[PDB]
Coordinates of N, CA, C and O in Angstrom, one line a residue:
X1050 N -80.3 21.2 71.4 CA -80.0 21.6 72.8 C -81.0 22.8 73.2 O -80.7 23.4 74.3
X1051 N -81.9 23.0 72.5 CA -83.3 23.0 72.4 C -83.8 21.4 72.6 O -83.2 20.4 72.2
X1052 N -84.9 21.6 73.3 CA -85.1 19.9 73.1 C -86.3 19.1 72.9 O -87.0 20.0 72.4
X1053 N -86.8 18.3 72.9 CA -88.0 17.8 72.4 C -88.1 16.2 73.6 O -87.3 15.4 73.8
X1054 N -89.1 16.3 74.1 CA -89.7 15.1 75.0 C -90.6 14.2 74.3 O -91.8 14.5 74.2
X1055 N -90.0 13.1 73.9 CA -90.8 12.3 73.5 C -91.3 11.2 74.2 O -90.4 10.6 74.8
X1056 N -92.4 10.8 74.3 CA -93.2 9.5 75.0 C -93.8 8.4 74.0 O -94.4 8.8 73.1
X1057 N -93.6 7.3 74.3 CA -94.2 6.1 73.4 C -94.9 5.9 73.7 O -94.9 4.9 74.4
X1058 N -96.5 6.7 73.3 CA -98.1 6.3 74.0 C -98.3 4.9 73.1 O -97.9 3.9 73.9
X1059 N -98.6 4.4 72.0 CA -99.0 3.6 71.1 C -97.7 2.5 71.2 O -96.5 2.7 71.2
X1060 N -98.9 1.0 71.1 CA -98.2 -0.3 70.5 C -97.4 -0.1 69.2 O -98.2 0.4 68.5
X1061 N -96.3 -0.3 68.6 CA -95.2 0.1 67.5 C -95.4 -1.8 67.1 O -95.2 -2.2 66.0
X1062 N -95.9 -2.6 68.3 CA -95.8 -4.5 67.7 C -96.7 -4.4 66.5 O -97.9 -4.0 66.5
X1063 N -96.0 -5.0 65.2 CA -96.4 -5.3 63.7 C -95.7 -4.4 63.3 O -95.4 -4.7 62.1
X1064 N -95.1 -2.6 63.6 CA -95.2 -1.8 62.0 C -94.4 -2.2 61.5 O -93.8 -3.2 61.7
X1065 N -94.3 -1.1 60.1 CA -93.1 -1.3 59.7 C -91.9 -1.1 60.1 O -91.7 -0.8 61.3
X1066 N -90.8 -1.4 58.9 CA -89.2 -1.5 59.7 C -88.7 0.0 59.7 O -87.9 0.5 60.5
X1067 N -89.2 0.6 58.9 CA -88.9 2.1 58.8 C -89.5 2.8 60.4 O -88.6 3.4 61.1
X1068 N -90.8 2.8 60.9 CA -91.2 3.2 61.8 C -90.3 2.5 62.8 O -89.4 3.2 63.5
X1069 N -90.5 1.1 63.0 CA -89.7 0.6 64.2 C -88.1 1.0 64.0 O -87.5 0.7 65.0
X1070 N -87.3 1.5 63.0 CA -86.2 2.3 63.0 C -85.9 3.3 63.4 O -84.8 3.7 63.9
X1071 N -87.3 4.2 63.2 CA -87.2 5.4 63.5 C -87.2 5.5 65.2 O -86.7 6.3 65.9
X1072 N -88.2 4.1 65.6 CA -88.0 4.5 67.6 C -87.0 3.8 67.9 O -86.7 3.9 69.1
X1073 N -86.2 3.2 67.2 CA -84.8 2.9 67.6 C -83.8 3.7 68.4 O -83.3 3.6 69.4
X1074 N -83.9 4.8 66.8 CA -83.0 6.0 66.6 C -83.4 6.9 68.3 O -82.6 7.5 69.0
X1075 N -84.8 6.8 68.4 CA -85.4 7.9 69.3 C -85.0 7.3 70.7 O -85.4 7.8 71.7
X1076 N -84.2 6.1 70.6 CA -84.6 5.2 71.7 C -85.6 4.7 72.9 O -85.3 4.5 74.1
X1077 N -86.6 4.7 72.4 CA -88.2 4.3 72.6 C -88.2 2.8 72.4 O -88.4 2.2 71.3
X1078 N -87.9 2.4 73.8 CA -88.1 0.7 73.9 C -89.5 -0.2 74.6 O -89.6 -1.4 74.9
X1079 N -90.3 0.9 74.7 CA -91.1 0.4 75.7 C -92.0 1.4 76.2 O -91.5 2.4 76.8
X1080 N -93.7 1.3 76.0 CA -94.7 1.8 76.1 C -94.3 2.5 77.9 O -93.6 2.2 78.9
X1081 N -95.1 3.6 77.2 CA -95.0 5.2 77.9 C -93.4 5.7 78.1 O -93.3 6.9 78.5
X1082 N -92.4 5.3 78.0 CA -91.0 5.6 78.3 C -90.7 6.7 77.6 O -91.1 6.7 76.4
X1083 N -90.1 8.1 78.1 CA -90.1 9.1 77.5 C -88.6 9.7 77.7 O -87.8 9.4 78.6
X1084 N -88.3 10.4 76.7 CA -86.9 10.2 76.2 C -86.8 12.4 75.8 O -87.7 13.1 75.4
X1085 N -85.6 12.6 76.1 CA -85.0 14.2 75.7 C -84.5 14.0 75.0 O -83.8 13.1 75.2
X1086 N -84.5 14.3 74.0 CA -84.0 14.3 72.9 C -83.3 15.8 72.3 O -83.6 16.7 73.1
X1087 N -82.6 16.3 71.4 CA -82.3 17.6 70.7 C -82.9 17.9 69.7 O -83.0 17.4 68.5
X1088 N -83.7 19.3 70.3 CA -84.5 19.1 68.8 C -83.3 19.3 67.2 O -83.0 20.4 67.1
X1089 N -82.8 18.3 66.2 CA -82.5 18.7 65.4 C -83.5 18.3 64.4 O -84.6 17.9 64.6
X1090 N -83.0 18.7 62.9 CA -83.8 18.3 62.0 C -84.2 17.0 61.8 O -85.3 16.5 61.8
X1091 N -82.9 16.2 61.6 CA -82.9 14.6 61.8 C -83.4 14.1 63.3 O -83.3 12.9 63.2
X1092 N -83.8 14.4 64.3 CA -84.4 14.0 65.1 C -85.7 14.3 64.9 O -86.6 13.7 65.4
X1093 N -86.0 15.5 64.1 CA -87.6 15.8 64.1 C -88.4 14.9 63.2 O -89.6 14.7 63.3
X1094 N -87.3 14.4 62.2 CA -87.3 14.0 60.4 C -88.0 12.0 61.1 O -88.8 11.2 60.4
X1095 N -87.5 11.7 62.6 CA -87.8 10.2 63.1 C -88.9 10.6 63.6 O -89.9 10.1 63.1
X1096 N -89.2 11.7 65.0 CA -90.5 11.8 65.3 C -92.3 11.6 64.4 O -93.4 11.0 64.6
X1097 N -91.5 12.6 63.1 CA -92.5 12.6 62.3 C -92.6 11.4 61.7 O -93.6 11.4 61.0
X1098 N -91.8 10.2 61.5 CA -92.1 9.0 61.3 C -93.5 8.4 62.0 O -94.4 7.7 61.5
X1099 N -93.4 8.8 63.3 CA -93.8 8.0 64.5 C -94.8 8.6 65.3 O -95.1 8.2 66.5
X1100 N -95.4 9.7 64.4 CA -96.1 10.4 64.9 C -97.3 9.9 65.4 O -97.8 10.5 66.4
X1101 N -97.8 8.8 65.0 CA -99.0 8.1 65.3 C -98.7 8.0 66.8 O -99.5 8.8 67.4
X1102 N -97.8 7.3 67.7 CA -97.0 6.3 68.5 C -96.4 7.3 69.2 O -95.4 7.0 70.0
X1103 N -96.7 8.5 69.1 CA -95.5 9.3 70.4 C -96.5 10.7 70.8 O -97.5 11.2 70.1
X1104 N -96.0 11.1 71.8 CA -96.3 12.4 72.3 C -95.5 13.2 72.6 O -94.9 12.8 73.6
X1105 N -95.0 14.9 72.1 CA -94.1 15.3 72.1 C -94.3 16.8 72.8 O -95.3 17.6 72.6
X1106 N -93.1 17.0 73.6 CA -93.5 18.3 74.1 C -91.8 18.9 74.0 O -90.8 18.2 74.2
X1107 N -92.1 20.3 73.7 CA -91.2 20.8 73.4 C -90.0 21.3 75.0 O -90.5 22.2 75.7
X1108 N -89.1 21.1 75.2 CA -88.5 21.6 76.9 C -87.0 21.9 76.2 O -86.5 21.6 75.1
X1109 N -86.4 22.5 77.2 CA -84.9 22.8 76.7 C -83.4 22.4 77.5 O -82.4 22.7 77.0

């Protein structure tokens, strides 16, 4: 509640199931769609999954 803005710049079609779990979790369904999220550890623990595939700015 600190928070973290994520965007799904990058195609996620082929990766793996870990990556494509991790934008699950982020709920990132669909190129450029951008999502608030909290920054917790386990939310940071998926970003950094996905880091190829997202763009993140930090907001509160």
């Amino acid at each position: 509640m600190p928070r973290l803005k994520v965007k799904l710049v990058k195609s996620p079609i082929g990766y793996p199931k870990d990556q494509k779990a991790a934008l699950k979790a982020l709920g990132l369904r669909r190129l450029q769609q951008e999502r608030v999220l909290e920054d917790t550890p386990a939310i940071r623990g998926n970003v950094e999954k996905v880091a190829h595939l997202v763009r993140v700015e930090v907001v509160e």
